[PDB]
Amino acid sequence: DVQDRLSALESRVQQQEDEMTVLKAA
Amino acid sequence: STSDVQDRLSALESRVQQQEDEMTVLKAA
Amino acid sequence: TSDVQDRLSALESRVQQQEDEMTVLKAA
Structure with a gap:
């Protein structure tokens, strides 16, 4: 429940934690 | 407490x- | 529990x- x-x-x-690391990378 | x-x-x-929304906007911008 | x-x-x-990380970027 x-x-x-x-x-x-x-x-x-x-x-969202993943997109951030990627964006910081990219 | 529940x-x-x-x-x-x-x-x-x-x-x-x-935040999820904040993200997509940036990826856009 | x-x-x-x-x-x-x-x-x-x-x-x-996560929110703190964004505000830092919204600067740049």
């Missing part, structure tokens, strides 16, 4:  | 979406 | 750090 929500967030944050 | 988790949750999914 | 509390705080940390 909540945990579905937690886990969906660490996905979105990870991708 | 309301608090609920509240903390919803505030996080709000902040993250705004 | 602590894991739930722990997962929360680890997320609000990443997000603030």
